[PDB]
Write a protein that binds this ligand. Structure first.
Ligand SMILES: CCCCCCCC=O
Ligand SMILES: CCCCCCCC=O
Ligand SMILES: [K+]
Ligand SMILES: [K+]
Ligand SMILES: [K+]
Ligand SMILES: [K+]
Lengths: 448, 447
């Protein structure tokens, strides 16, 4: 089959040794830089068609991080790839002890649809830097990016080592029967279990970047104006379709009304009075997801927004107050511009609220009290944490990005990408000469 | 069920916060130190009964590494557990960026039978240090150590947080239905896939320490007296039942008889003429494994040994010459005292031989030519590597221990154990101060 032949060619090309010299890897990374530069208008147009993005947020909210990653890993690749001496002991002082890094082989990257360029190419950048063949499976939901990547990737990258696999769920299922040396999947918690089950048949290690509801705790005593501007920004970028969007708000009921008003103000500054007329506001990816998200407003106390246009998959920025935690909008990852507010009476209540639910990909708190910050971190668990901002903690080269529990396992970005897509092999190299001090280990054992 | 309630109690204990203070973890680690000191005779007796170890190799080949790990982790725990600052950028100078380590929760350790104390308790030591509840499943095949641990662990450790689950395959299958936050399993490649499949049901991350055939390449021009004494030691310790034993030898045909003679010489020095009478020689763990290993001798050319005693599960130290790579002894992990020699005609042929097989837990090479060593490492892949020795590379605090491909995923030992049993959580803390340098990120976007 076409899928099986693609993987066969990728493994043969890996086995030829072509990816091992750093020179080759840097060239492929420089080819991706060229792709981003030459295909700028094509990439913008695909994101516009898929997600109603424009040239500005296509670059600053997605593509730029791929370029940043490429530039960083190119500059650091020789240091990362070098054998790494480690601490010795008195008994090993004449030996070499070091960590040897080597590629895993053929890596599979399964992209998702909400950031269809970054979440396909930024993982690939890492796997390329580590010397692997990298098979790509774009998500079919962002049809235009999927079609574009299938066209332009082979025009820049090695054709056998870095193939693009077209199709939807049936094709991914057949792809997942092939033998890979690592699989990185971004998407839903449920499908993560399916990926891990398929990987188990080959003992394939997996990096699973999954889902959840990223809580956003707002401290009574903080600067509600700057806090609410940042929350609005992170909740409503990409029309709410972000893996680390602040999903919902936990706040004292005594500030629910001020939070609603300052969110409204910031939203009006961002997108104007009618977000439907703003070039900076996105659309829902599909008819199914539009229907799903609209369903989450039914029966709720709408403080703002609450309408949607099925024809264009527009859902107006929506805020819900006094939300029952047991209601639909609080029982699934929203992934839409509907922001519920859940009332808690204390920090300790919020911690308990967070801890009773599955571990989220991100946890956010807004507060100028360091005791509040340290305590919420110490008593909770999440993939990552941001205090007094949203989104940004997953854009930093020094902060590995990934989940825990139902939000996923493993991480990548920056140096962690190189490690995740490598085997780190412990090496002990001794001189081959008689060592009187070793003789104590040989039998016979001392009889007394 | 007993198993359900045990894990229930362990998660309740963990969720109360009892393991979070470092002083509590150190108290538990100190209790393990006291266990090892106070239960020395009992541990030796169980290892003698299960595996025909003695007082000396019970300690120096198994238990000492657990003590070393405990002392090391106690010393380093505050530093390892500290929030770890990471590199900032021009845009994040006013921010805090750091890695926060936190326990995963309830960790399961499934032990195996060949080092039944070390491969249950040394993983546990790391998971305790990282602040987790640790459920233990000893291997049923090492019956005496399994029963001993079920008795003494709750006599020394917190009884809710660190339960011992009794039983065999059915009980392990039952246990694997429970929801854990990490599973470390040491055992066979095939069962590792079963573990990972069970883990996937709860999105449980796994550390799988599995199997394969660790090759031992012997270079034509090296000091064979030194090399063969080291190879003999690693191959025949624990009666060959070691995950990183040098499984088979690859060598030029011209040194095959020299290798045989020098192996024989070292074996007689170690164990005497009749290894059955040596206090230092082990026994096979079970009747099934005894019959399995004897079967691998069938049809082979025996240069030394080749006999066994079924009733006491003794297999004489055995060397096989001119082995066909397609024969049974070269088609499964031997895990016994049978050492096949496969002839190859160059280093390149050896590398190709190794690469056409599944990635081994360990790869060994003996050579006084650094270029030979570097080339074989460069062109192969294995969990770890030792050049000019065997075994020892998995005993060093600074060398993470684990496989790749069919020999497993993940690693532990020393600091790596603490990382493996933690969630490393990226943290960004910014001032909630208005920033004019951030406002460029907000809509409306420029033209
Ligand atoms: C900074 C690299 C990742 C940013 C793109 C969106 C991430 C969503 O999962
Ligand atoms: C501290 C070295 C590892 C423990 C010894 C046995 C390893 C597995 O057979
Ligand atoms: K390095
Ligand atoms: K000795
Ligand atoms: K033969
Ligand atoms: K602006």
């Amino acid at each position: 089959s076409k899928i099986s032949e693609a993987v066969k060619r990728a493994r043969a090309a890996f086995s030829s040794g072509r990816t091992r010299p750093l020179q080759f890897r840097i060239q492929q990374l420089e080819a991706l830089q060229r792709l981003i530069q030459e295909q700028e208008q094509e990439l913008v147009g695909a994101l516009a068609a898929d997600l109603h993005k424009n040239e500005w947020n296509a670059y600053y909210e997605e593509v730029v991080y791929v370029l940043e990653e490429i530039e960083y890993m190119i500059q650091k690749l020789p240091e990362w790839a070098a054998d790494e001496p480690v601490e010795k002991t008195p008994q090993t002082q004449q030996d070499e002890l070091y960590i040897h890094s080597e590629p895993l082989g053929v890596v599979l990257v399964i992209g998702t649809w909400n950031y269809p360029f970054n979440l396909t190419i930024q993982p690939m950048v890492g796997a390329i830097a580590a010397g692997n063949s990298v098979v790509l499976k774009p998500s079919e939901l962002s049809e235009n990016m999927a079609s574009l990547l299938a066209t332009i990737i082979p025009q820049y990258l090695d054709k056998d080592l870095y193939p693009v696999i077209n199709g939807g769920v049936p094709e991914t299922t057949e792809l997942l029967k092939e033998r890979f040396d690592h699989i990185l999947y971004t998407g839903s918690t449920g499908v993560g279990k399916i990926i891990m089950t398929a990987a188990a048949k080959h003992l394939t290690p997996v990096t699973l970047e999954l889902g959840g509801k990223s809580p956003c705790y707002v401290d009574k005593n903080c600067d509600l104006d700057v806090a609410c501007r940042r929350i609005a920004w992170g909740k409503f970028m990409n029309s709410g379709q972000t893996c680390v969007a602040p999903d919902y708000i936990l706040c004292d009921p005594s500030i629910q009304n001020q939070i609603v008003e300052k969110l409204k103000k910031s939203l009006k500054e961002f997108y104007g009075e009618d977000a439907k007329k703003s070039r900076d506001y996105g659309r829902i990816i599909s008819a199914r997801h539009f229907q799903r998200v609209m369903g989450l407003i039914e029966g709720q106390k709408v403080a703002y927004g609450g309408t949607g246009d099925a024809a264009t998959r527009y859902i107006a920025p929506t805020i819900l107050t006094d939300v029952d935690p047991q209601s639909p909008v609080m029982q699934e990852e929203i992934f839409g511009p509907v922001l519920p507010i859940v009332c808690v009476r204390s920090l300790e209540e919020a911690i308990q609220f967070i801890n009773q639910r599955e571990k989220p990909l991100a946890l956010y708190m807004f507060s100028s009290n360091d005791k509040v910050i340290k305590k919420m971190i110490a008593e909770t668990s999440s993939g990552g944490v941001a205090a007094n901002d949203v989104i940004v903690h997953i854009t930093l080269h020094s902060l590995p990005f990934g989940g825990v529990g139902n939000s996923g396992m493993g991480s990548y970005h920056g140096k962690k990408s190189f490690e995740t897509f490598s085997h780190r092999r412990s090496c002990l190299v001794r001189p081959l000469m008689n060592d009187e001090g070793l003789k104590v280990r040989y039998p016979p054992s001392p009889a007394k």
